Amino acid sequence: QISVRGLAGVENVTELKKNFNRHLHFTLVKDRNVATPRDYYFALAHTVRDHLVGRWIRTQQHYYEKDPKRIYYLSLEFYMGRTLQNTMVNLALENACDEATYQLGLDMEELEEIEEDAGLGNGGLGRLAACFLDSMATLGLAAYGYGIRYEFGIFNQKICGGWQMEEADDWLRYGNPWEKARPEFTLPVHFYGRVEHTSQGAKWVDTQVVLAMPYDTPVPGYRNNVVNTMRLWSAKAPNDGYIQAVLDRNLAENISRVLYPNDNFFEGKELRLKQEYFVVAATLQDIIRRFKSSTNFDAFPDKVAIQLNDTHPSLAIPELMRVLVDLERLDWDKAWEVTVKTCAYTNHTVLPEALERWPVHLLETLLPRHLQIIYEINQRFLNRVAAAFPGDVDRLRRMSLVEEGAVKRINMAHLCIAGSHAVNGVARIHSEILKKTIFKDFYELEPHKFQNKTNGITPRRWLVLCNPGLAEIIAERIGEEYISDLDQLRKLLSYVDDEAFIRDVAKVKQENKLKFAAYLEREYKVHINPNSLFDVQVKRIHEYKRQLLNCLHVITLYNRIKKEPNKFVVPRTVMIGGKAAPGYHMAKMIIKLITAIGDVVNHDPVVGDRLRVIFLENYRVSLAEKVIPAADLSEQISTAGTEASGTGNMKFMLNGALTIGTMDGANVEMAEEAGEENFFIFGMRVEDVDRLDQRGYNAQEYYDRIPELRQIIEQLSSGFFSPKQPDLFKDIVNMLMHHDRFKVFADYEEYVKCQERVSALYKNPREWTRMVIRNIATSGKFSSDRTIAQYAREIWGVEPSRQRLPA
Amino acid sequence: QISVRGLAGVENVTELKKNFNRHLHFTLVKDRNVATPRDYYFALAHTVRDHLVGRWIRTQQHYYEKDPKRIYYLSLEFYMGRTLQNTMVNLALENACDEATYQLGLDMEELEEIEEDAGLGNGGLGRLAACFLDSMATLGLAAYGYGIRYEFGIFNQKICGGWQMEEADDWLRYGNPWEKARPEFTLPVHFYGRVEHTSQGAKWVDTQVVLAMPYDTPVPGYRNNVVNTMRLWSAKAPNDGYIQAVLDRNLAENISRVLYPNDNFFEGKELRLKQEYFVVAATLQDIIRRFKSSTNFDAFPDKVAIQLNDTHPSLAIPELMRVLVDLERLDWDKAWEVTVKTCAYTNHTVLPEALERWPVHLLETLLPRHLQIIYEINQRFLNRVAAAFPGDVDRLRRMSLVEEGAVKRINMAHLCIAGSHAVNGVARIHSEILKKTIFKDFYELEPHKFQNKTNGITPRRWLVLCNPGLAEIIAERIGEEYISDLDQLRKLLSYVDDEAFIRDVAKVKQENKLKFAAYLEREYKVHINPNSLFDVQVKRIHEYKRQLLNCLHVITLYNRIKKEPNKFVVPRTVMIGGKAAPGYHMAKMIIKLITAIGDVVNHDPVVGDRLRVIFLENYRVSLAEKVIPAADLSEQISTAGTEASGTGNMKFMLNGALTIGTMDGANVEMAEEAGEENFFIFGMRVEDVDRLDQRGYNAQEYYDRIPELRQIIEQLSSGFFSPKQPDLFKDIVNMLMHHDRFKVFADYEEYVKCQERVSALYKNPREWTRMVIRNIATSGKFSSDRTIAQYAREIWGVEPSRQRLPA
Ligand SMILES: O=c1[nH]c(=O)n([C@@H]2O[C@H](CO)[C@@H](O)[C@H](O)[C@H]2O)cc1Br
Ligand SMILES: O=c1[nH]c(=O)n([C@@H]2O[C@H](CO)[C@@H](O)[C@H](O)[C@H]2O)cc1Br
C-alpha cells in the first residue's frame, strides 16, 4: 500500500506465507478450521521473529569479534508496548506481511490488535528507557538493557461509577513469543547474612540465595541489521512439612512478581528494595563475566559503561565496590577509581517526595555489607568536602550520604553523585535547577560532573508506526532519510506556503480523528463529534501535572455556554486519561471529578455537541499510539519547575498537534525551536513561582478577585457535580483553598485567556495548519537518536555509527 | 544399527538433519559454537515432535468425523518418565535419528540422558496409568487421560550419611518441549460458597473461583499413526494493599503446585482434597462440552466412559449429579441412571490405612453442595439395602457411605461402588479378596458389578525401549509381530533346547550387567562385580513390601561367610532402591539400616567381593529402564494378601530375571503361566496368614527357635551396625518383636531356604538360562494391551482396533 512501509516482492510474499502455515501447523498445532484470530496473530509473530534471529546471532558475534566498549542501561522500568509492528517496521517486512496476510484472507491490523502491551513501566521514565533502546540499536551501539521480568505489569484500569478499579495485568497469560528463556545462565543473588572480618578482610556469610534466571528479548535497529539484547531477570528459588517447604518457594519468587505502581513517589517498602538489589546483583556478575573474556581491571572503564536510570539501580555502586574489594581483592582506592569511571547517573525529578531515602535499618538487615561500604564511601567523601571548605560544618551535614533524624536514611541521590563520573538532568531548565538548588553543594565541589541531556522519543514508533499517513506525505516531499535523521524535517519549512501540502497535512489529521472517533464507539460505546477540536491531556494523574486546572477550564467553558446558550463557541472534545497509583487518594478523587463533570456536561441538551468531556480508560503505550496522532491541542500544564522534561509533549509536537503549556521542562526548548509565536505559552515562570513562595501563596486572594472561579468552587462545594453526595469533593476544594503545593489558582486566569486564543486560531483552518507545519518541521531536535548520540559522545565515550551490518 | 529400530532411509536422514539445524537456529537461537549438549537434546526433541503433530491433528479430526464412544481415564497420577526415545520407537524414527545425529557428530544416547523424567506419580498406580495410555493408543481407542500438571513431581532423593534427604523435583526448569499450553480452553472451578434453595431447586453461590488451564501432551500408538491426548490442568487465579492482593494470587495457584508424595497411605489434608476436586470439576465440563457437539443425556453413556483410577477422582460421581440435577435440570432418578452407566471404579488396595475416608467437616466447608448430594445418595442406597435384607441393621451401618465415630467420615470407596456400574481389582487373588472381605456386603447386594482386570505393562517401554539387545534376539527368531501381540512370545518355548539361543539370551544379560556396573561407577563411584548374581529389590519403601526381610537375608549371608570364611558361596550384588514418603518415620529408618549394613559388609576384607550391598539412590522410571534389564533375581516378597498386584514383577519377568516371591497379587498368575517349577515361591499363603491371626502372631516364638535370627537381632540391638549410636535401630527391633503387622519372622526361615536354591541353580548357567527362556516365553499375558482389551470389551463396551490410520 504506502511507500514508507517497504517492498512487497513476489519472492518474499511467497516465503512469508509458507512460514505462516508452517508455524500455524507445527508451532501452534492448529488447523485452518479451528484457528482463532489469536492463533493467526501468533503464527504471524513467530513468522516475523524468524527474520530477527539470524540477525540477532550475527550482531552478538560481531561484538565478540570486534570487542567494543559495552553500554549497560540499568532501569527498573522498560515500558515497551507492542513489538510486532515495530519489528516489521525496523526490518522492512511491513508491506510484504500485509500482502502475505491479505492473500491468506486475513486483515493484518485486526491481528496487531491482539498483542498484549508489555507494560513493564509506569510512564515517562520507563518509556524513555524503551525509546533509548530503539535508538541505541539504530545507532549501532553495543548496548544492553537490564531490568526485571515482572510477571504483572502496571495494572489495567477499569472505571466503575467513575471510580478507578485496578485489575492485574496478566500479560503472560497466552505466552510471549518475543522472549527467549535462558536458564543456563542463571545466577545467584544474596540477601541477609552478616559480615565477618578475617585477616584477609570481610566475608558476607549465612546468606539467603535467590536465583536470577534471564530472559532475552531482541531489540532491532532501524534497517541496519543490528539486533541488540534486552535481558530481564526472573526470580527462582534454589532446589534445597515437605509440602509447606515447597509452597514457600513462592516467598523467594515474589521478587519478580509485580511492578510497584507509584510514579514520582517514593514508598520505602522492603519488597521494592529487594527488587532494586536483585537486578543490580545479577546484572553486575553478567557484566564482569562478559569483561573476563576480553587480574586487570584498569581497562574496566574502557570496556564497560553503566547508565543508572534514576536512583532505582543505585546499589550498582556499592555492589561494584563489594565485588572489586571483597572478592577480586583490589585495594579500595583503585576499586573506587574504576567505579566512578564506570557509572554515570541520570536524575528525573526535583520533587522531595520522589527522592529515595532508604531507612538505615532496612539496609542493615538486608544488605549488611553494602551499608558498611556506604559508610566508608560517605566518610571519605566528607573528607574531600571538609578539605575543600574548611570549617563549613553546615555543608558537611547537608552533603552527607547519611541523613540524621528520628530514623536515619541513606540519601540514594547523594550516593550516585558521589560514585559517578557524570550526572545529568533531562532538559535544559531541569539541569539548571539541579545546579542552582538541590545539588548546588555537589556542583560547587565537582562542576565538571554536571551535564544535560534533553530527552527525546523514537521517530519509528512515534511517527512511522502510529502515523503512516503523515510519514507518507512527509516522505513524498523530502524522501525517507528523515526517519533516522529527524533534523531533516526542517526542509518542510519551505512548504509552509504550499496549498497542496497544507491540505494534505489537514487531511491526514482529519482522517486520524475519524479513526479515533470510530475506535471510541466500537470499543467503549462513546459518541464524539469529529469536527470538534480534540483537546487532550494524557499522562499519569498527579497533583503536579495539574489535571485540576484542566478541569476548571472545562467547567468554565460550560458555565459560559449556560450563561449565553445561543452564542457560537468552537466545539471541543476534551479528553483526559491516565492511571493513578492505587494508594494516592487525591489522584483517585481527581479521576472521580473528571467523570462527574462528564455526567453533567455530556447530557445537558443546551450544550449540544459543543462540549464533550471524555475520560480515557486504561491509558498505555498502545492507546497512546492511537490518541496522539488524532489530537489537535496538547495539554502540558504543570507548574513551572516541577516537570523534569516530559516526553508526551514531543510525541504530540511530532504528530501535528499544537501545544498549550507552561514554561516547564522540555516545553521551554520546544517553543525555542518552533518560535514562541507558534506555541501557546501561559502562566508563571520558575522565577514567579519563587516570588510567590517568599511572599506566601494564598489562594483565597484569587477566589475573591475572580467571580468565574468563585462560581466553580461554589458548584464543587454544594454538590452541583455530585447530587447524591453533596460533600463528595470537599477534599479537592479544601486542598485547592488551603493546601495546594502547585498553585492551580495562580495560573487560572492566564490559562483561560490563552485557551481563548487557541479557539480563535482554530476558526481559521488555514492558519492553524501552517502553525502545525511549523511545529512538525522543528521537532527534529526531540529525536532520541539525538539524545543517544550526546550520551554516547559526552558520557560513554563511543562513536555512534549509522553503518549497516551485512545481511 | 539393530533391526527392530526401523529404517535409516537416505531420504529421512537428510530431512531430519536440516530440521535439527533449523530448530537449533530458529527455536533454540544458538549457533554451533555455543550449543551445549542440552541445546542438542532440545533441537532433537523439537525435530521429533514435528512428526507427531500432523498425526495428532489428524487423529483428533478422525474422532470428530467418526464420533466414537470416548474413554476418560481420570487419575491424580501419570508417571510418564522420558518421552523422546518412546516417541522415536512408536514412530519408527529411531534408526534414522541415530544416523542423522551420528552424521552431525553427536551421540544420541548421550543426548537421551539429558531429558528430565516427568515424575508426576509415586509408583505403581501412577505408572499403571502411563502404561495404560500407551496401550489405549496402540489399540486405537478414543481415549484421554486427565490429571494435574504438577509444577513439582515426586521429590528427588539424595542420601546424606545413609539418610534420605528430599529435594524439589524442578522438572520444568528448562521447559517441556512435549506439552502444548491451551489457555483458550481455561475453565472455572468453584470452592466454598453455600447452598441456596429456591422454587427452582439448589444453587451454589458466593464461591471462590480458581481457573483451570489445560496442557496437552501427545500419546502416540505403536506404528499405527494414532496420537491420543493427555490433558493436564494447571491452577490459575482469576484477574479480579494492591501489592499484597497480587502476591496472594499464589494461594489459588498452590492447587497444582506439587504432588502429594504418600503412596499407599491416606493423609486427609485440605490441599489434597482441593486437588481431587480441581481435576474432577475441570474434566467433567470438558467432557460434557465434547458431548454437546454430537437436552438428551440418555445417550450420555453410549458416548462417554469415565474410569476412576482408585478413589482419588471419586467426586466425579457427586459432581456428575450436581451438573445433571442442578444445572441441566434432569430429574434425580434419571441423572443417577446416567452416572452409574457412565462411571466405573478400579480399587488398588486392601490396606486400611490406604483407604480415603474424608472428614465430613472438610467436605462441608469446601464442597457444601456435594455433601448434600452424598447424603441423598447414601439415603437411597440404604433403602435398597434395607429392602433386600429386611431387619439386618448391622449391614446398614457397615455399608453406609457415612462412618460414625468421634469425627464423621465419608468412605470414598463405598461411594464409588454405589455410583459405578463396574468395580475391579487388579489381579485375580486381589479381586477374590475384595469379594470375600472388605466389599463382601456390596458383592452380596450387586454381584454383577464385581470384576477382575489383572494389570499389565507396555512392551514398548519395558522391552523394546530398555532392552533392545533382547528384543533383537527375540525378533531374529520370531519376527516383530510380538511387540503388539505379546502372546506370541510362547513361540520362544520351542527354543528352550537351542544351544545358540541359550547363549544369545545369556550374552544379552551379561552385556546389560556390564553396562549397569559401568553406569554405577561413572555416575556414583560404586565398584560392583559383574560376575555376581544381581539380586534386586526396587519399589517404594513400605512395611508391607518387606524390605526388612530382604535385609535379614543379607545379614545372614554375611554371618555365614564370617563363620566359615573359606567356603565357596555364589557371589551376589544385593541392590535395594526406592523412595520413602517424607513423614513415614519407619520407612526412613529402613533406608538407614540398608546403608548401615552396606558400611559393614562392603568393607570387610574377608568378604572379598563375595557380597556387596548397594542402595540405589533416586529410584524412578528412567532408573528402572536401566536396572531391570540388568537383573538376575527379582524380589517380590510382600506378605501374602497385601500387594494388590504389583507391576515391577512383570517388568522383571519380561527382561530375563528370575523371581523369588510369595503367593501374592499378580505373582500367583505369573507362576501359574510359567509353571511353579520355574518360579521360586516360598512362605505363607493368604490362608496361613489368617490362621496365624486367629491364634495370634507372636514373634518371640521365632526368636527362640531360630539361632540364626536371634543372632541378627542381637547385632541390631547392640550396635554391631551402628558403632557410634548403639541404640540407633531400637525402633526396628522393637517393631519386629512386638508390633509387626506383616509377620517378617514368620517367612524368614522359608525365605532363606528358597534363597539357597536360587544360588544352587545359579551355579549351572545353562539351567538358569533355560528357566529364564521359560519365563520370558510365558510373560505374554502381562502386556497392558491384554488388560486394556479386557477393559474395552467387558467394561467400556468398545471394540479394540489394530488398524492403521492413513499417514
Ligand atoms: O518516577 C518517575 N516517573 C517518571 O515518569 N519520571 C519522568 O521521567 C521522564 C523521563 O526522564 C521525564 O520526561 C518526566 O519529566 C519525569 O516525570 C520521573 C520519575 Br523520578
Ligand atoms: O497408593 C497407591 N499406590 C500404588 O502404587 N498402588 C499400586 O497399584 C498398582 C497398580 O494397580 C498395583 O500393582 C500395586 O499392587 C499397588 O500397591 C496402590 C495404591 Br492405593
For residue A659, the distance in angstroms to the closest alpha carbon of chain B comes to 36
**Distance between CA A36 and CA B564 in Å, rounded?**
79
For this structure, is A545 an active site residue?
yes
Confirm or deny that B39 is annotated as ligand binding. Answer: no
For this structure, is A743 an active site residue?
no
Residues A651 and A791 in one domain: no
Residues A35 and A76 in one domain: yes
Residues B232 and B307 in one domain: yes
Task: Tell me if B260 and A243 make a contact (CB, 8 A cut-off).
Answer: yes
C-alpha cell recorded at residue B700: 518371640
Contact residues on chain B for A175, CB-CB shorter than 8 A: 181, 183
Q: Is the CB of B346 under 6 A from ligand 2?
A: no
Resolution in Å, one decimal place? 2.4
HSE-up of residue A521 (Cα within 13 Å, Cβ side): 9
Which CA distances in Å does A616 have to A158, A379, A656, B686, B730?
A: 10, 51, 20, 78, 75
**Distance between CA B655 and CA B512 in Å, rounded?**
10
Look at ligand 2, atom 14, and give the residue with the nearest C-alpha: B646
Q: 447524591: which residue's cell?
A: A724
Beta strands at B304-309 and B343-346: parallel, antiparallel or unpaired = parallel
Cβ burial, residue B602 (10 Å; 0-12/13-18/19+):
middle
Eight-class DSSP state of A804 = P
Residues B322, B414, B449, B540: which is the catalytic one?
B540
- Cβ-count burial A583-595 (b if 16+ within 10 Å, e if not): ebeebebbbbbbb
Q: What is the CATH number of the domain that holds B289?
A: 3.40.50.2000
> Residue B613's beta-bridge partner residues?
B574
- The DSSP H or E segment spanning A308 is strand A304-309
**Distance between CA A409 and CA A358 in Å, rounded?**
5
Contact residues on chain B for A260, CB-CB shorter than 8 A: 243
Cβ burial, residue B240 (10 Å; 0-12/13-18/19+):
exposed
**Distance between CA A292 and CA A335 in Å, rounded?**
16
For this structure, is A647 an active site residue?
yes
**Which are the residues after which chain A is interrupted (C to N > 2.5 Å)?**
240, 294
C-alpha of residue A269 to centroid of ligand 1, in Å: 20
Residues B515 and B367 in one domain: no
**Distance between CA A205 and CA A195 in Å, rounded?**
6
Question: Concatenated DSSP letters for B564-579?
Answer: STTS----EEEEEE--
Question: Concatenated DSSP letters for B708-772?
Answer: HHHHHHHHHHHTTT-TT-TTTTHHHHHHHHH--TT-HHHHHHHHHHHHHHHHHHHT-HHHHHHHH
C-alpha cell recorded at residue B419: 455410583
Residues A439 and A461 in one domain: no
For this structure, is B647 an active site residue?
yes
Residues A172 and A272 in one domain: yes
Residues B494 and B432 in one domain: no
Confirm or deny that B781 is annotated as ligand binding. Answer: no
Residues B230 and B168 in one domain: yes
Which CA distances in Å does B157 have to B116, B163, B580?
A: 14, 10, 9
- Which ligand 1 atom is the nearest neighbour of the CA of A265? 1
Ligand at shortest distance from the CA of B782: 2
For residue B196, the distance in angstroms to the closest alpha carbon of chain A comes to 29
Radius of gyration of chain A (CA): 27
**Distance between CA A281 and CA A733 in Å, rounded?**
47
Kindly give the interhelix angle for A585-601 and A730-738, rounded to the nearest 10 degrees: 110
Which CA distances in Å does A596 have to A159, A590, A614?
A: 12, 10, 10
HSE-up of residue B191 (Cα within 13 Å, Cβ side): 21
For this structure, is A436 an active site residue?
no
Which CA distances in Å does A427 have to A139, A313, A781, A784, A796?
A: 22, 21, 12, 13, 19
**Distance between CA B773 and CA B163 in Å, rounded?**
39
Task: Tell me if A242 and B250 make a contact (CB, 8 A cut-off).
Answer: no
- 3-state secondary structure at position A528: coil
- C-alpha dihedral sign at B172, B175, B178, B181: positive
C-alpha of residue A790 to centroid of ligand 1, in Å: 19
Q: Is the CB of B644 under 6 A from ligand 2?
A: yes
Residues A450 and A471 in one domain: no
Question: Concatenated DSSP letters for A548-596?
Answer: HHHHHHHHHHHHHHHHSTTS----EEEEEE----TT-HHHHHHHHHHHH
C-alpha of residue B285 to centroid of ligand 2, in Å: 28
Q: Are A329 and A292 in contact (CB under 8 A)?
A: no
Contact residues on chain A for B26, CB-CB shorter than 8 A: 50, 53
> Residue A231's beta-bridge partner residues?
A146, A216
CB under 6 Å to ligand 1: residues? A 122-125, 128, 263-264, 310, 348-349, 354, 426, 455, 643-647, 665
Task: Tell me if A168 and B582 make a contact (CB, 8 A cut-off).
Answer: no
**Distance between CA A337 and CA A665 in Å, rounded?**
33
Which CA distances in Å does A632 have to A502, A531, A653, A751, A760?
A: 15, 11, 10, 17, 14
* Chain A residues interacting with chain B (CB cutoff of 8 angstroms): 25-26, 29-31, 36, 38, 50, 53-54, 56-57, 61, 152, 155, 166-168, 170, 173-175, 180-181, 183-184, 216, 239-243, 246-247, 249-250, 254, 257-258, 260-261, 269, 271, 582-583
Task: Tell me if B174 and A183 make a contact (CB, 8 A cut-off).
Answer: yes
Kindly give, in sequence order, each residue whose CB lies less than 8 Å from that of residue B301, ignoring residues fewer than 6 positions away.
B338, B341, B342
Task: Tell me if A258 and B271 make a contact (CB, 8 A cut-off).
Answer: no
Task: Tell me if A247 and B261 make a contact (CB, 8 A cut-off).
Answer: no
C-alpha cell recorded at residue B47: 525435530
- C-alpha dihedral sign at B203, B204, B205, B210: negative
Strand order in the sheet with A533-538: A611-616, A572-577, A533-538, A633-636, A658-661, A680-681
Beta strands in A126-178 (DSSP E): 143-148, 156-160, 163-167
Residues B777 and B792 in one domain: no
Q: 437436552: which residue's cell?
A: B295
In this structure, the number of other CB atoms found within 10 A of the CB of residue B229 comes to 20
Contact residues on chain B for A38, CB-CB shorter than 8 A: 184
Choose the closest CB to B241 out of A240, A249, A582.
Answer: A582
Nearest 5°: phi and psi at A119? -90, 55
**Distance between CA B6 and CA A44 in Å, rounded?**
37
Residues A532 and A659 in one domain: yes
Q: How far is CA B260 from the centre of its chain?
A: 15
User: Can you say whether residue A702 is alpha, beta or left, with left for phi > 0 and alpha for psi between -120 and 50 degrees?
Assistant: alpha
C-alpha of residue A120 to centroid of ligand 1, in Å: 15
Task: Tell me if A180 and B54 make a contact (CB, 8 A cut-off).
Answer: no
Q: Are A477 and A502 in contact (CB under 8 A)?
A: no
Contact residues on chain A for B158, CB-CB shorter than 8 A: none
C-alpha of residue B72 to centroid of ligand 2, in Å: 20
Which CA distances in Å does A600 have to A594, A612, B103?
A: 10, 10, 77
Look at ligand 2, atom 10, and give the residue with the nearest C-alpha: B125
Task: Tell me if A168 and B239 make a contact (CB, 8 A cut-off).
Answer: yes
Please give the residue of chain A at the shortest CA–CA distance from B240: A167
- Which ligand 1 atom is the nearest neighbour of the CA of A644? 15
C-alpha of residue A645 to centroid of ligand 1, in Å: 7
What's the domain range around A178?
1-456+784-807
**Distance between CA B204 and CA B218 in Å, rounded?**
36
- 3-state secondary structure at position A359: strand
Beta strands at A658-661 and B680-681: parallel, antiparallel or unpaired = unpaired
Q: Could you tell me how many residues make up chain A? A: 807
Beta strands in B221-264 (DSSP E): 227-236
Residues B49, B312, B348, B786: which is the catalytic one?
B348
C-alpha of residue B579 to centroid of ligand 2, in Å: 15
Task: Tell me if B170 and A239 make a contact (CB, 8 A cut-off).
Answer: yes
Q: 532475552: which residue's cell?
A: A216
Residues A513, A540, A546, A770: which is the catalytic one?
A540
Cβ burial, residue B152 (10 Å; 0-12/13-18/19+):
buried
C-alpha cell recorded at residue B636: 517380590
C-alpha of residue B626 to centroid of ligand 2, in Å: 22
Confirm or deny that B293 is annotated as ligand binding. Answer: yes
Question: Concatenated DSSP letters for B383-435?
Answer: HHHHHHSTT-HHHHHHH-SEE-SSS-EEEHHHHHHHH-S-EEESSHHHHHHHH
User: Can you say whether residue B787 is alpha, beta or left, with left for phi > 0 and alpha for psi between -120 and 50 degrees?
Assistant: alpha
Residue type, B617: E
Kindly give, in sequence order, each residue whose CB lies less than 8 Å from that of residue B695, ignoring residues fewer than 6 positions away.
none
Q: Is the CB of B577 under 6 A from ligand 2?
A: no
Query: Biggest alpha carbon distance in chain B?
Result: 90
Radius of gyration of chain B (CA): 27
Task: Tell me if A257 and B247 make a contact (CB, 8 A cut-off).
Answer: yes
Confirm or deny that B491 is annotated as ligand binding. Answer: no
Q: Is the CB of B645 under 6 A from ligand 2?
A: yes
C-alpha cell recorded at residue A763: 476558526
Task: Tell me if B242 and A155 make a contact (CB, 8 A cut-off).
Answer: yes
Eight-class DSSP state of A488 = G
- Which ligand 2 atom is the nearest neighbour of the CA of B646? 13
Query: Biggest alpha carbon distance in chain A?
Result: 90
Contact residues on chain A for B30, CB-CB shorter than 8 A: 57
Question: Concatenated DSSP letters for B657-716?
Answer: -EEEE-S-TTHHHHHHHH-GGGSEE-S--HHHHHHHHHH---THHHHHH-HHHHHHHHHH
**Distance between CA A51 and CA A90 in Å, rounded?**
11
Strand order in the sheet with A357-359: A357-359, A409-411, A402-403
For this structure, is A539 an active site residue?
yes
Confirm or deny that B291 is annotated as ligand binding. Answer: yes
Beta strands at A180-181 and A156-160: parallel, antiparallel or unpaired = unpaired
Q: Are A112 and A85 in contact (CB under 8 A)?
A: yes
Q: Name the experiment that determined this structure.
A: X-ray
Residues B364 and B215 in one domain: yes
How many domains, chain A?
2
Look at ligand 1, atom 5, and give the residue with the nearest C-alpha: A124
